[PDB]
Amino acid sequence: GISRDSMHKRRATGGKQKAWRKKRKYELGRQPANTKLSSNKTVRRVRVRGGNVKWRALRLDTGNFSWGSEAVTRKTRLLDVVYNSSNNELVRTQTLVKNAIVQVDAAPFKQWYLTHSNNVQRKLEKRQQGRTLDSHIEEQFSGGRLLACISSRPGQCGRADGYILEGKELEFYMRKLQ
Amino acid sequence: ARGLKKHLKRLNAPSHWMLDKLGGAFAPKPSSGPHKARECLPLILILRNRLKYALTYREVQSILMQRHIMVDGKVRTDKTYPAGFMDIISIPKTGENYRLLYDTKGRFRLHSVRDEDAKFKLCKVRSVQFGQKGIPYLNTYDGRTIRYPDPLIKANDTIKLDLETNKIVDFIKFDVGNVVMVTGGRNTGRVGVIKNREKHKGTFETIHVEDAQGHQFATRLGNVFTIGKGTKPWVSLPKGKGIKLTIIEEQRKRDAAAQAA
Amino acid sequence: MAEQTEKSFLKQPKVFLSTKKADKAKRPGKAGNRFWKSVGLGFKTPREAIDGTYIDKKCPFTGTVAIRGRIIAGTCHSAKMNRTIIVRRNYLHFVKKYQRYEKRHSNIPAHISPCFRVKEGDHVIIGQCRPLSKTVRFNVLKVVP
RNA sequence: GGUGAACAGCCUCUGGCCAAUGGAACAAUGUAGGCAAGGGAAGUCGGCAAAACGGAUCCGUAACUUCGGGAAAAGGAUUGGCUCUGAGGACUGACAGUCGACUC
RNA sequence: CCCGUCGCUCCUACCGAUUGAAUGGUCCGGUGAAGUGUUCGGAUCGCGGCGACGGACGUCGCG
RNA sequence: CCGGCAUCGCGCUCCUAGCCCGGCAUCGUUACUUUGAAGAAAUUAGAGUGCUCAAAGCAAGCCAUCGCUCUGGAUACAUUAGCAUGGGAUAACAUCAUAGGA
RNA sequence: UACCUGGUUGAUCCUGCCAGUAGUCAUAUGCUUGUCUCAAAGAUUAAGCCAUGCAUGUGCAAGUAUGAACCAAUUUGAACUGUGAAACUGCGAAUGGCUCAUUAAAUCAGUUAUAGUUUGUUUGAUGGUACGUGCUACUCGGAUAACCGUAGUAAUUCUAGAGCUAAUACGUGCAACAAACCCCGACUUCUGGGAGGGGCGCAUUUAUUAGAUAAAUCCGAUGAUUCAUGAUAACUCGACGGAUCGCACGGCCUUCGUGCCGGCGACGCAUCAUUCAAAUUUCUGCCCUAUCAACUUUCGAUGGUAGGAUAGGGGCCUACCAUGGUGGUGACGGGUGACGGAGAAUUAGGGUUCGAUUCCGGAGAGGGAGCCUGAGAAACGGCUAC
Ligand SMILES: [Mg+2]
Ligand SMILES: [Mg+2]
Ligand SMILES: [Mg+2]
Ligand SMILES: [Mg+2]
Ligand SMILES: [Mg+2]
Ligand SMILES: [Mg+2]
Ligand SMILES: [Mg+2]
Ligand SMILES: [Mg+2]
Ligand SMILES: [Mg+2]
Ligand SMILES: [Mg+2]
Ligand SMILES: [Mg+2]
Ligand SMILES: [Mg+2]
Ligand SMILES: [Mg+2]
Ligand SMILES: [Mg+2]
Ligand SMILES: [Mg+2]
Ligand SMILES: [Mg+2]
Ligand SMILES: [Mg+2]
Ligand SMILES: [Mg+2]
Ligand SMILES: [Mg+2]
Ligand SMILES: [Mg+2]
Ligand SMILES: [Mg+2]
Ligand SMILES: [Mg+2]
């Protein structure tokens, strides 16, 4: 099958390498997952070396995204893939892949952000003097869906986890999105 | 090949097993166990080849399946158990205790000990680090793991363990000037006092040891083993008090033993 | 800014930039401050590897590679690739039949960090790391020109 | 004007024509054009005549040689439609704005 | 003493038209068994929900 | 055959650190050379051992050779590459004259 | 034992080869052969082809027994008591063994490294919440082999169907606190809170934060880490957190009720460490050949970035970009009647030649290719295709 051997490559000098083995299992590969973004959530078991289990995620809609600048991690529902640093085709065919850029609900994040009697307003006034909340992400809330960077390995672990963009990374991806 | 190798051929056997060459094709192949399995002795070598309580594989099987042969506080019926350094092998029916130590020429003797210095063993630690929920534990070269270590016991050190409380009672801090005995290589067997210890960044730490009567040598860290604090050991040494004697000297011993009779 | 030059935004793992509670002196790699690691072995982490903007996951000091194995000294033979050189390890060989020495050699690919700056034929000291590529198993730790 | 490398062929616009004696029928033999099962030059003095190949892109290209060629050798692959992506510019005040007919 | 041509016998190798021939490989292309992974698919087979109906039926529960 | 000394010995704060004081860090490379470690056994060399010798083998020998003693099962070699310590004669590399020196 | 002897000449002194001389744990063969000890034996040619038979199966007191047997034999209540053949389940069959075809920095040797990984097992340590509105556990499913019976097929450990009956096979499903803390949070008094009640094992992934200094009250490791590890927010249609099996009985009544109970084990789940290992991997080293001087690169060549895949690093593969990598210190290419090494023969020293072979490593099972199970296989005394 698909193999990760260095045998079929050339040598560093560029000469062919006459084969001396038949392919071994412990140098196999497996065909990629091409995890789609779709409602019919589907993750299938694969049994790998050592007998343990890997989760091939064929297709997901609901992911788990963090918001570091406020340290809140909410489940959310994926909207679409909009940028992918290796291939435009992957954006076109909507494949969930690490370091891709998806768009997320903003519903858990909005309802969290409204959070944060006298015991309550006293705590709100103790906070809310330190709100900074950059306009680049606030306008994105007002648009109603946030940019997020998927940081899991969906074909490896079976999830779409990630983090909301802020700062220079936000503004650099933004300046490429227009 | 395509899996673990389950046979061991006599010539491939460790050289300190002493076992002969035309004795067969295969050797006991010590099972995976708590000691390094190239530095070990199967209990079949303990029984048949040293103590001679049996004469065959099957008779040693009878020995062990009788549940008599008890190791380190608990009977071990495996016939390829990797018993090694300061493992204590007891036999209730003979009421007879043994402890496995290196002798100066690089091999293993079974030194008899009485019950008080058989109620406990003594071993070095591999490393101490944290575990789940932040509970510290330490790892020994016998494989044993001990949780809640004394906040002073560190790596490379030595610790005594009783077989009833099954925990630490005291520990020797591996440091300069404490009696050691090398457990691997050409210097193995020789006890001696550490006299220097120099460290080089990124490689094995070198231990310069002096024997009880003048000779000096060096060794790698994985091979040395503190016994007692200062010159006094906390274990009963064998008939040679850990001094490897030059071949000329050992010839003179046998010549003198001849001319004394 | 200069160093972000590719189709992904280069950034240091587990290092979080746009944080609320940040301060310039906590420890590098934390609270928005750039990560770096003292590779050790008497090798000193370069000043521009400290105050550098380049982001490079294969740098010994600022990346995710740990220098372990054996350490070699050679000479920069060429610097004609991206963040990598080929070091030529000149030495002598012993021909036992003839009791004489023939000089042999070996070209070794070595990864330089952008902190270092190599010209052709500069004495270099490299150390072993995990396999970075088909041929590169070493990182440059010292450059003497 | 369109296709197209193109003053090729094919079709159209301005301008010019339907002028070549017409009616009926669709027999043989003709002149010009085609198509044929299986075989594939056996036909014949002779592959005469016809069929086949044919543009373009990518790869590959022998003997011999006057070292210039042979060479478009030979031998292979791809080509439509539609929806896209990328690269290549001009003018104005390492950026911003305006425009852009095309080629890959 | 001796050199070479020519004549004859035998051995060995050479050049040589023959689009020479055979064996074995390698590469490109064409075709492509089979397996693995994937999409639809749904032969049957599981509380046999409910009609409060007379071992049956349809709505059937999802797997 | 060598320790340590002094002479016209750039300093060390820190571990090794005297009954003010030996023998302390970092701030040019190598080769060569000494010593050390790690070095699989079998093979070879080589110690012990009367398998009757010998090739061998790793045994076996002595108690009153009466309910057990003493046991051995050594040691060497292992060029080249790697690690580590002492030397700096011999031999290569790099290089204080712009002083950007101490 | 660091050695020479015959042959160019009429004779001499040489360069020089030819022949002699000796060994081979080096094969064949020829002649011959009474004793003891020891012991290679289809490698060279054909990694050509194979009749036959065997070579891997497995049972404890301790997973499953009136399905059919043997021994005990019943006061005719209950056992299936004890021996168990068949069968289910589990484990091993990935070792052994045989050969050297392919393979010339490749395998292999010495030496590293994994902080870049998986590892049934051994050994040692370890494990709350299964839902109840965290205010002490809450219910037990049929079917399946062996057997009995009816059969097709010429047929094979080929094969359909009916009737039975289990689990440590399969599938469900009771849960041991103060909740330590974490976030919400009625009102009180004003709170720096009381807080009444509502949300929180272990594994998986993601993200935040901590994981401490320097001379005038800081606490783990490394040569080196965002390490070990902790807290947090979540997340999974969660693998898991024991419906298992043995004997020996033996203190004492709460309802004197096999009654309050209780130990020693067997197996098994998961985590960490250990071990058996593996897989990669660093440096240096291999025979002959220049009538093999350029090779690599559109289609992976060398590197970068991002990802995918792997147990894991990595052009292993994909997308984009750069124009690189090797070479007269011999690349690339070709030969090898070439597996590598420990080593063998011969040896004054130095060397020369060999090493298929019983020890280690690798590779193959007619030639290729592809996979199931499993911790471990690209297995061939396993399967699929040509
Ligand atoms: Mg094998
Ligand atoms: Mg055109
Ligand atoms: Mg025209
Ligand atoms: Mg025709
Ligand atoms: Mg013709
Ligand atoms: Mg003809
Ligand atoms: Mg004719
Ligand atoms: Mg003719
Ligand atoms: Mg013609
Ligand atoms: Mg021609
Ligand atoms: Mg000679
Ligand atoms: Mg002459
Ligand atoms: Mg004569
Ligand atoms: Mg001769
Ligand atoms: Mg052969
Ligand atoms: Mg055959
Ligand atoms: Mg990568
Ligand atoms: Mg061969
Ligand atoms: Mg072998
Ligand atoms: Mg095989
Ligand atoms: Mg096979
Ligand atoms: Mg067979």
Opening angle at CA B219, ends B216 and B214, nearest 5:
10
Q: Tokens 């023939």 identify what position?
A: C102
Among residues B174, B261, B251, B188, the alpha carbon closest in space to that of B219 is found at B188
Per DSSP, A51 falls in state: G
Residues in chain C with CB shorter than 8 Å from the CB of B201 are 40-42
Q: How was this entry determined?
A: cryo-EM
Whether C40 and chain B come into contact, CB under 8 Å, resolves to: yes
SS3 A44: strand
Residue whose CA lies closest to nucleotide G102 C1': A20
Strands C100-102 and B216-220: unpaired
- In whole angstroms, give the CA distance from residue A89 to residue B54: 75
Cα distances (Å, whole numbers) of residue B31 to A123, A137, B43, B80, C27: 65, 62, 10, 5, 48
- CA C116 / C1′ G138 distance in Å: 70
Using the mean position of ligand 12's atoms as its centre, give its distance from the Cα of residue B238 in Å. Answer: 84
Contact B51, B100 (CB under 8 A): no
Contact A112, A76 (CB under 8 A): no
> What radius of gyration, in Å, describes the C-alpha atoms of chain A?
22
- In whole angstroms, give the CA distance from residue B223 to residue B206: 10
- CA B1 / C1′ G361 distance in Å: 10
Chain C residue closest in CA terms to B201: C41
| Yes or no, beta carbons of A70 and C20 under 8 Å apart | yes
- In whole angstroms, give the CA distance from residue A7 to residue A27: 10
Contact B85, B110 (CB under 8 A): no
The end-to-end CA distance of chain B, in Å, is: 58
> What radius of gyration, in Å, describes the C-alpha atoms of chain C?
18
Closest approach of B246 to chain C, Cα-based (Å): 34
Strands A146-150 and A100-104: antiparallel
Supply A147's token pair.
């940019």
Among residues A69, A30, A61, A62, the alpha carbon closest in space to that of A46 is found at A30
Contact A104, A79 (CB under 8 A): yes
| Yes or no, beta carbons of A169 and C17 under 8 Å apart | yes
Contact A112, A102 (CB under 8 A): no
In sign, the C-alpha dihedral spanning B125, B126, B130, B131 is negative
**3-state secondary structure labels for all residues of chain B:** CCCCCCCEEHHHCCHHHCCCCCCCCEECCCCCCCCCCCCCEEHHHHHHHHHCCCCCHHHHHHHHHCCCCEECCEECCCCCCEECCCCEEEECCCCEEEEEEEECCCEEEEEECCCHHHCEEEEEEEEEEECHHHCEEEEECCCCEEECCCCCCCCCCEEEEECCCCCEEEEECCCCCCEEECCCCCCCCCEEEEEEEECCCCCCCEEEEECCCCCEEEEEHHHCCEEECCCCCCCCCCCCCCCCCCHHHHHHHHHHHHHCC
Strands B136-140 and B145-147: antiparallel
Using the mean position of ligand 4's atoms as its centre, give its distance from the Cα of residue B236 in Å. Answer: 110
Residue A110 CB contacts under 8 Å (≥ 6 apart), including other chains:
A141
Per DSSP, A28 falls in state: B
Opening angle at CA C111, ends C106 and C117, nearest 5:
105
Contact A75, A61 (CB under 8 A): no
Strands A53-60 and A35-37: parallel
Cα distances (Å, whole numbers) of residue C6 to C9, C10, C11: 7, 8, 11
Residue A11 CB contacts under 8 Å (≥ 6 apart), including other chains:
A17
Resolution, rounded to a tenth of an Å? 3.4
- In whole angstroms, give the CA distance from residue B137 to residue C139: 35
Chain D bases near protein Cβ (<7 Å): 84-86
Chain G bases near protein Cβ (<7 Å): 39, 93-97, 102-107, 112-116, 118-126, 184-195, 202-213, 220-237, 239, 271-285, 295-297, 300-320, 322-327, 329-333, 350-352, 358-365, 368-371, 373-380
Residue ranges of alpha helices (H) inside chain A are 88-93, 107-114, 118-126, 135-143, 154-157, 167-177
Q: Which nucleotide is nearest to A34 (CA to C1')?
A: G308
Q: Which of residues 3-22 of C touch A (CB under 8 A)?
A: 4, 6-9, 11, 16-20
Using the mean position of ligand 1's atoms as its centre, give its distance from the Cα of residue A6 in Å. Answer: 25
> Does an H or E element contain C47, and which?
helix C47-50
- In whole angstroms, give the CA distance from residue B113 to residue B98: 6
Contact B216, B243 (CB under 8 A): no
| Yes or no, beta carbons of C42 and B201 under 8 Å apart | yes
**B29 labeled binding residue:** yes
Residues in chain A with CB shorter than 8 Å from the CB of C9 are 168-169, 172-173
- Helices then strands, each counted (H, E), chain A: 6, 9
Supply C84's token pair.
């990598």
Cross-strand bridge partners of residue B2: none
| Yes or no, beta carbons of C17 and A70 under 8 Å apart | no
Residues in chain B with CB shorter than 8 Å from the CB of C71 are 202
Cross-strand bridge partners of residue A148: A102, A164
CA atoms lying within 13 Å on the CB side of residue B185: 12
Cross-strand bridge partners of residue C95: C100
Chain C residue closest in CA terms to A13: C135
| Yes or no, beta carbons of C9 and A169 under 8 Å apart | yes
Per DSSP, C6 falls in state: S
- In whole angstroms, give the CA distance from residue A146 to residue A133: 14
- In whole angstroms, give the CA distance from residue B179 to residue B209: 9
Using the mean position of ligand 7's atoms as its centre, give its distance from the Cα of residue B197 in Å. Answer: 110
Cross-strand bridge partners of residue B191: B181
Residue C98 CB contacts under 8 Å (≥ 6 apart), including other chains:
none
Q: Tokens 């928005």 identify what position?
A: C32
Residue whose CA lies closest to nucleotide G285 C1': C93
